[PDB]
Amino acid sequence: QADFEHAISDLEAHNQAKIGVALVSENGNLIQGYRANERFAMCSTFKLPLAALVLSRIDAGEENPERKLHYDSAFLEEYAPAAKRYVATGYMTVTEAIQSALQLSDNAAANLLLKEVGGPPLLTKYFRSLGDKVSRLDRIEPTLNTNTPGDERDTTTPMSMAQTVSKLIFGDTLTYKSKGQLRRLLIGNQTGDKTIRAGLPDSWVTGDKTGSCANGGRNDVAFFITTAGKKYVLSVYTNAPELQGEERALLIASVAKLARQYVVH
């Protein structure tokens, strides 16, 4: 505990960074943390709960995975690599939007889903319905990434998001079908190979969602399953303005690698 904390502190000082981390068990209990209850910007980590909300509306018969979400170039965003590919067709399905939002972090895809669930206020409501008293969305993409110090819009804490993610992935509020879909989608994430996953062994099942924002923000939340079958969530939130991008990912990987050491013990 003492050791894990001093290790993260050393990483802060070496990198002139701020790091928040929570490692939780299947049931949401804190195993190890550092600044676990400090507020950070979600950045794109919000897309994981967003996808769960959409899945919960499918579960409730309020949404259909093949429903066409019609849009045109007016709905594009600067970072929207899938939506730009599909725009000439005039739509993406709910399914395609979920996959794009999760595995590519597509901002237009995420905005399409936000539109269909009732916008950031309804994602906040969703967080509260899960027992997450902290996490909140307020803005749509891309303005939710400003990461201004002291601004509580669009924020979580490492503990809260770790506990929310553990509930979604290992808990039972989603149907078994949706829970399975979410897990396989996260495992297939394309943006997290240099982040938490780079600090975990390849033999562990891992799924994650990254975030990147202004003021040097770089985040990742992952679930993983060890070879002994034990289940965890690791949230890692960082602000590292003095680091270059590859160095920001290495910092998260470094955190994961320290977590790996604790899990093994």
| Catalytic residue annotation | 44
Q: Tell me the torsion sign for CA atoms 7, 46, 210, 15.
A: negative
Are residues 127 and 213 in contact, defined by beta-carbon separation less than 8 angstroms?
Answer: no
88 binds its own copies (CB under 8 A): yes
- Residue 47 C-beta-side C-alpha neighbours within 13 Å: 33
Exposed/middle/buried for residue 3 (C-beta within 10 Å: 0-12, 13-18, 19+) = exposed
* Residue 153's binding partner out of Mg ion, Cl ion, its own copies, none, with CB under 5 to 8 Å set by partner kind: none
- CB of 109 or CB of 236, closer to its own copies: 109
Residue choice 24, 48, 82, 159 for contact with its own copies (CB under 8 A): 82
Give the number of residues written for the chain: 265
Binding to Cl ion by CB under 5 A, coded x per residue (else -) over 194-233, reads ----------------x-x---------------------
* Site track 131-170 with Mg ion (rule: CB under 5 A), x = hit: ----------------------------------------
Cα gap 237→67, rounded to integer Å? 34
Cα four-point dihedral sign 106, 84, 215, 114: negative
Cβ(255)–Cβ(11) under 8 Å? Answer: yes
Smallest distance from the beta carbon of 99 to its own copies, in angstroms? 9
218/43 Cα distance (integer angstroms):
8
73 binds its own copies (CB under 8 A): yes
Residue 95 interacting with Cl ion (CB under 5 A): yes
CB of 5 to its own copies, least distance (A): 29
Residues binding Mg ion: number (CB under 5 A): 8
CB of 123 to Mg ion, least distance (A): 17
Binding to Mg ion by residue 249, rule CB under 5 A?
yes
Other CB atoms within 10 A of residue 74 CB: 6
C-beta of 125 vs 194, nearer to Cl ion: 194
With 0-12 / 13-18 / 19 or more C-beta atoms within 10 angstroms meaning exposed / middle / buried, residue 19 is: buried
Q: Can you tell me which residue has the tokens 């924002």? A: 213
Choose which of 31, 198, 205, 214 interacts with its own copies (CB under 8 A).
205
Helix (H, G, I), strand (E, B), or coil: what is residue 43? Answer: helix
Instruction: List residues near its own copies by CB under 8 A.
Output: 73, 81-82, 84-89, 96, 100, 104, 184, 187-190, 193, 197, 202-206, 225
Instruction: List residues near Cl ion by CB under 5 A.
Output: 44, 79-81, 95, 98, 105, 181, 191, 210, 212
